[PDB]
Symmetry: D4
Subunit: 219 residues, 8 copies
């Protein structure tokens, strides 16, 4: 288990992270964490590692691109003094290009995304014990569907950044791909983006695997 007793773990990203969490604080008291993968991660950690006393804060906000994360980074991340920061961003950065392909101000192309996300990591890295970078995802099995294909570009950048900054790394797309061998997207998500409970569990488990979670701990 990479996360240590007493420490503060802070999630940030878009509606996948937000899931109706409490604003502004995103912390603690039953329901504050929203009802998706963040809440599940904390549930399992508290079920299985109750003694760790891990504080978890949810700063997801629906709609955010990486450009929005940067605008609020100081207040929502730096000022929180986390020990661990988890980031999952990119879906909206990419989606806007496909759902509002003529309101370009709304779009965030790959080169801006990459540099902005590197900027978040590099500002944050000296301040915390660790960063976990979760790729974005599109719940779509064909690699050549245009939005899937774009999304994969952004996920490869995320991996590149995690390798280079020695951040932890979660490839959320690879986790969904495995399940898409059996299920069509409609069974897993709304509009290839908004996951069901099962989708949130896929994300939660992927995240927990990367931080060394044990389902039954090693005596």
């Amino acid at each position: 288990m990479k996360i240590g007793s007493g420490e503060k773990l802070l999630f940030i990203g878009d509606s996948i992270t937000d899931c109706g969490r409490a604003r502004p604080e995103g912390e603690g008291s039953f329901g504050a964490l929203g009802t998706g993968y963040v809440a599940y991660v904390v549930g399992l950690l508290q079920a299985v590692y109750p003694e760790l006393g891990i504080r978890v804060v949810n700063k997801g906000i629906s709609g955010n691109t990486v450009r929005d994360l940067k605008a609020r980074w100081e207040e929502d991340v730096i000022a929180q003094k986390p020990d661990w920061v988890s980031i999952m961003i990119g879906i909206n950065d990419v989606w806007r290009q496909y759902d509002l392909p003529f309101m370009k101000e709304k779009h965030v192309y790959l080169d801006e995304y990459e540099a902005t996300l590197r900027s978040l990591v590099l500002e944050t890295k000296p301040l915390v014990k660790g960063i976990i970078l979760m790729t974005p995802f599109y719940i779509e099995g064909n690699e050549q569907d245009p939005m899937r294909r774009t999304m994969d570009q952004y996920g490869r950048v995320v991996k590149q950044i995690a390798e280079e900054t020695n951040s932890l790394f979660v490839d959320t797309q690879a986790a969904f791909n495995e399940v898409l061998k059996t299920l069509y997207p409609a069974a897993l998500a709304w509009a290839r983006v908004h996951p069901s409970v099962a989708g949130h569990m896929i994300l939660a488990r992927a995240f927990l695997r990367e931080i060394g979670f044990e389902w039954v701990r090693s005596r």
Copy 2:
């Protein structure tokens, strides 16, 4: 793992099982399974065993004792033709005796509880592939707290019926007990009965382990 491809798994119980599930069907759209252990079990099964094709139904109803289960058993269990039936009942059977001590007809005492549960299990067994009996529970660490002591006794009756009938058995109380060595009830539940997400993960995991779930499949 005990549940098999193509099988229908039906859950029944009180509000712990219910958790806002869709009525009457308890099946059939994102959200239909409610927001507690039953949804978590299904999410995990689908995350790790997508190909199993498991059909899941939530027949929990808030407020139910075993007497209420018996009155709707034909419509809500038998007529559903489940392959597996999971039962968790007893919390209200017991709690009425402590929160409305002078309304005696609302109480389901041990004798009515054993007889009626036993009966529902024996009628159901010849008609399904398997039955999982989950004990009731009370989120309280002191065995000699009157309502905990009584809840443990009711658990002992579930355990016998489960051996008497060769059903799978989940001791939900032992699962909570482990965590209560670190946490006080108020950190885990409201009013020592209604668990948090964490509480519901304890339950979901206890069930999953009993049916042979692997967090990572061996291969």
Copy 3:
């Protein structure tokens, strides 16, 4: 144009047709026809052919497959004595197979779809002046996407029934296909099924062109 002065045109289908229409009547006040292609068709007919005196009824119901159409056909089509009946069904027939793959009784497979639709068309034909069969559709440009491929097959069945019975025919999918050479589905619809205003104009126009509507009347 094919529809004539004084005639009753009745539309039936699923949520695409429904769009919030008034229940049960689906006729009879500003708003009664709902907010999608059916209202747009009526608006255009009235804008360009005010004198035609066309009476229009919306019997769409959200969620319906062809099986549901058959159960209410007598009350909602026959007893209305329409002169024309427009049918667009098949999206849910197909979509249940992909979004609830393990609930098989909710699926309307090809054989049930052809038989039941064919039957409803043959019973209805002797009793009305004309019938317009609109294919179902899926807002997806890749033919080999599983659900699109299956939706195209269902369209082929509508086309035969339509030739088998000499009904007017509207290929809604070809209408969407044209636009999908420029736009990705998310720009046109939610979840590749529920169209925007634009989507509904594509449908309204496809219908209108089939019945001989002129945008400006020749004179």
Copy 4:
């Protein structure tokens, strides 16, 4: 088609234009354009000219007279940098005289209307590729009904202004007159002002005809 690829088309006027559009932005994302002639114009343009990538903004506000448009012109029009501006105003300017004929501060008489509307055009004309001036309307067939008669005065001014400023021009009254040969107003509108879907379609089509829209484009 007068409107060119990439360009921004901005509608402004009163509740006929507003139709519940999103405030303040009036742009894009499904529903932002409200549910009347503006939304219909954009639907048809996107159905038929998907490749044009036209941005459309709705700045209608219920209740506005031309005096209100001027008070917000800088923020709601100039600062939007439209390429095309469509204006339809006058209904309230006239209606207040007939529904609150003793709260005169509320009224805008013809001479003030004319000069104010000329002022909007003349400020705007050097900034944009084109202006479309839509007359106001009253859904009332008798020319000598006092409010109809007043409304026509204001429409003749609008035409005069469009001729003199070389703006495009839509005579919304003439479009309604044609339909009023067959339908009494009650069938088309609420209170001779608030049009049905069909009324909004009349407006939409009138507007599209003036900008060179083709229902089926010329190959």
Copy 5:
């Protein structure tokens, strides 16, 4: 004045009479009589003739034509044992012909109107002390407006039935006509049918004058 101490006066009609009255009783608490002419009549009678002890019932129902009155006449008039019955019906009888011209079964044409009203008046007369017939009305000053012309004809039928049967008669249209020489309809009503408070005072006064009300009692 025509109504007498201890008598039950029952009003029936459409939304003009209804005005939010309590259902089904239309009697029996502050507010039960609704917020229009019927409440104003009762208020005035009580202000000026408190000692008369007049019991008043409001059986108006929004949307009703004379056909609807006939279907509920037994339960809502006869069984109430009124001493006086006031009827104002015809607005919807007529308005359906203009706002839904192509839904012919919703129309109550002159022949059905005279027969059915006449019939309801003759059956009712032997059973009560008196009947007041109020003409329908339309808030429109031009006699040759089609719907006004038709409303006047319907008024003429009420007048004959009223002489044919020796009932009191209130020409609501003449009362509105007087005011329309100064005000345009929009100052008095919504959509030329639903009056303001002022409109309802015109009606209340017209009724009151017909039954011999004094504003200040002679003494």
Copy 6:
């Protein structure tokens, strides 16, 4: 009729005047005047004197004592530039003494009331054509009921002030007294203060009598 063509008549007082009127403006557009005696006065005036074009403003606010009227006099009266001002105040000034007889800061005793109300008149009188002073009231027939008795003291002061300032005068209590000869208060009002429709009509008619209203005008 004391009120002249074109002039502005402004009502102020407490909830009896307020009756849910629109804030802040209290003017015009159907419903703005609330639904009690003010609305009735305007209805009758417009029914009977439509040509007068009288503007009426309602500035009643629930809860006000004369101390509250003074705090808002400049903004709600002076700045409105009325031609006629109607005041009815005192109920709360008195009621607080009986319902909260130990929160004395809330009470306004007779000497403060008198001087404050004189102060309003004297500031206002040089600015307007006329002032109408309506006494407060308590719907209670026994003169020696303590609150009735107090209320009468305040009404005698109001009369004194009207005589001395040559204001018009309406004795609302005397109007209710006449009706209380027949009806117990419960039939007329809620809690001896909040009048029914009939109570509001009593007030309306009393007011209209004082300003020279004719029910049928003198030809």
Copy 7:
């Protein structure tokens, strides 16, 4: 004290007893007993006599006269098998005569009141351990106020029936009278009927003293 361990005490009456109690059961969860004297009695009994094990049921229904009690007596009293039955009825029996004086069938006059109450008491007596008859009341200090005088008479009938049948007797009016020597009704109640918390404590105490409650138990 008169009520004994293990006994069922059932309260019945009008809104004074009801006070928002749960329907139909009026028993069985925090809040089920409503928010007035009945809940206060139960709270006090439990505060001072926790060990008595008293089961309490609230069958009050707002609006009830004794005629309404009789219509539901079998289902709501007899079938509940109470040990004690407490009745407080008469306020509406009387109040209808004053607030709706001309709706005579809503009135329960003295003769119907004595007969029907007497009858309900005699049928009930053989079947229960005891009956407590609470007089109705009116919050008014003047005996010669018509409705108070009539309420006192109705109280006298309750007192006789109570001696005629050897029932416990609570003079609620004498309890209010004591306090009315200091407070005016408006300080204690709304509309002289609906008491404040204080009002309900007066009632609760009057009941408690009649059944032998000690505030501090002697010991």
Copy 8:
């Protein structure tokens, strides 16, 4: 009765005191005092000592620890100029330690609690006739349940402070202990903290006993 005619008694604490009282004022007008022990205390005092004219203010706010009371003391207590101040605080100070045992900023340990509460008393004592210090409570009969045990530490501090400052003193735990000999907590409260009506009555009576209340006053 320690509280004297005319004087102002002000309650402050957490949700047990708050009980939905009106903000900010917490005073008077029916409902302003919320619906728990404060309202009950005032009800009984007004029932039994109506002539005392005691003003009671409720400044309870849900969630407060003693740290929150201090932050608002000046505005909510000092500035109110009470004659008597009642304080009951500690539940949240203690609860946070057990329900959010890793958000320590939320906790208030015994030494800070003691000094802060002494600080409130000592600032307040020279300004008022008297202070009543009510211990906090936990509705839990076992002294060694960890939260009960902690709560008792805080109650012993409160007693210590009351002794030392010559404040009046109410031991709310001792009052609940007596009742817990018979009732399990579930019958008395929600989550061992939020009392039923009976629980609020326990508190109310305990408070009244300490200030010399008589149920029947000594003649």
